Design a protein around this motif. Sequence first.
Motif, short mmCIF file in Angstrom:
data_model
loop_
_atom_site.label_atom_id
_atom_site.label_comp_id
_atom_site.label_asym_id
_atom_site.label_seq_id
_atom_site.Cartn_x
_atom_site.Cartn_y
_atom_site.Cartn_z
N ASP A 168 53.17 53.83 42.37
CA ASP A 168 53.24 55.15 43.01
C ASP A 168 52.81 55.09 44.48
N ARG A 169 53.59 55.74 45.35
CA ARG A 169 53.29 55.86 46.78
C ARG A 169 52.06 56.81 46.97
N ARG A 170 51.83 57.74 46.02
CA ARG A 170 50.68 58.68 46.02
C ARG A 170 49.33 58.00 45.85
N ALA A 171 49.34 56.80 45.26
CA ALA A 171 48.12 56.09 44.96
C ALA A 171 47.46 55.49 46.18
N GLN A 172 46.15 55.34 46.11
CA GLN A 172 45.36 54.63 47.10
C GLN A 172 45.43 53.14 46.78
N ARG A 173 45.50 52.29 47.81
CA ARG A 173 45.60 50.83 47.68
C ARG A 173 44.50 50.30 48.60
N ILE A 174 43.35 49.94 48.01
CA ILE A 174 42.19 49.51 48.79
C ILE A 174 41.90 48.03 48.53
N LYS A 175 41.66 47.26 49.61
CA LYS A 175 41.28 45.85 49.53
C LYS A 175 39.80 45.76 49.17
N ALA A 176 39.45 44.66 48.49
CA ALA A 176 38.10 44.33 48.06
C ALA A 176 37.95 42.84 48.30
N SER A 177 36.99 42.47 49.17
CA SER A 177 36.82 41.07 49.55
C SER A 177 35.56 40.49 48.99
N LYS A 178 34.77 41.30 48.28
CA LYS A 178 33.52 40.87 47.67
C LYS A 178 33.46 41.36 46.23
N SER A 179 32.83 40.56 45.37
CA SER A 179 32.66 40.81 43.94
C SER A 179 31.51 39.96 43.44
N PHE A 180 30.81 40.45 42.41
CA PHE A 180 29.63 39.80 41.89
C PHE A 180 29.70 39.81 40.39
N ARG A 181 29.77 38.64 39.79
CA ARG A 181 29.79 38.53 38.33
C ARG A 181 28.36 38.56 37.86
N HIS A 182 28.15 39.02 36.62
CA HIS A 182 26.84 38.98 36.00
C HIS A 182 26.49 37.48 35.90
N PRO A 183 25.29 37.04 36.33
CA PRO A 183 24.98 35.59 36.35
C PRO A 183 24.91 34.91 34.99
N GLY A 184 24.78 35.68 33.93
CA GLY A 184 24.80 35.14 32.58
C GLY A 184 26.21 35.00 32.04
N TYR A 185 27.25 35.31 32.85
CA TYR A 185 28.63 35.19 32.39
C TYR A 185 28.96 33.76 32.06
N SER A 186 29.65 33.57 30.92
CA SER A 186 30.12 32.28 30.48
C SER A 186 31.64 32.32 30.21
N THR A 187 32.39 31.45 30.89
CA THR A 187 33.84 31.28 30.68
C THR A 187 34.11 30.73 29.23
N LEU A 240 31.19 40.85 32.89
CA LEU A 240 31.23 42.00 33.78
C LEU A 240 30.97 41.59 35.21
N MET A 241 31.55 42.37 36.11
CA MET A 241 31.56 42.10 37.52
C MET A 241 31.71 43.38 38.27
N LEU A 242 31.02 43.45 39.41
CA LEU A 242 31.13 44.59 40.31
C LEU A 242 31.98 44.17 41.50
N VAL A 243 33.00 44.99 41.82
CA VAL A 243 33.93 44.77 42.91
C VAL A 243 33.60 45.78 44.00
N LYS A 244 33.35 45.26 45.22
CA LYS A 244 32.99 46.07 46.38
C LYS A 244 34.21 46.36 47.23
N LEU A 245 34.62 47.64 47.22
CA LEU A 245 35.75 48.15 48.00
C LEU A 245 35.45 47.99 49.51
N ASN A 246 36.44 47.51 50.29
CA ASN A 246 36.34 47.31 51.75
C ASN A 246 36.10 48.62 52.47
#
Length: 224
Positions: A58-77, A84-90
């Motif tokens: 949709d052209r109505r939607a917002q399209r925001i870049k995010a260049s930073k993110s932080f995974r929970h340090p106990g995350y295991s692949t 879980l991870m927090l994504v920081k919007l630019n």
Amino acid sequence: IIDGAPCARGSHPWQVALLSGNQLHCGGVLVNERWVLTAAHCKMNEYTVHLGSDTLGDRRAQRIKASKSFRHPGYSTQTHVNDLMLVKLNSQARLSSMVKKVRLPSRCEPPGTTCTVSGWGTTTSPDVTFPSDLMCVDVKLISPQDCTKVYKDLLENSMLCAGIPDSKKNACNGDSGGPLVCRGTLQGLVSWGTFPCGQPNDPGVYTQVCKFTKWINDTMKKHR
């Protein structure tokens, strides 16, 4: 989303999609104007966040870049624990009737509770059918004891299981990191399940948001 239906328009304003090369990568949830919460499995060095439309493309939607993110340090692949991870919007999300913050939980909703999982993930499995419109399915929270019968010691206490008996109703690839909402609050993030998706009596496994409130608020605070 397997065996679901399009969500009612305007009812998932906190729902976001993480794009890579203009293709769906993961789902996510808007926490506040600066932050998106998703799965640690969705980690990328750069994200394109789609906000404010039930229709991807949709052209109505917002399209925001995010260049930073932080995974929970106990995350295991290996085990998908602490997924879980927090994504920081630019730049900040511009709030409206279509862009709103999710209600984070105070308590953990119990087994048997009805919830809604949503996303733009495939609607078929193994064969892929990516919809344009945001899909919804109702599921019920499954007790850890019942969920252990299927996944054994892979399951942890911060993981939440949801599904419907003898039903294909579930989340699939592309829905990852997306919301599971029960009684007005965010109870889980789509984390993992069996493959092919929508296998009856195989629950969808979610990151139990109610056990991560402190790290969520502390990480947004420290990286503000």
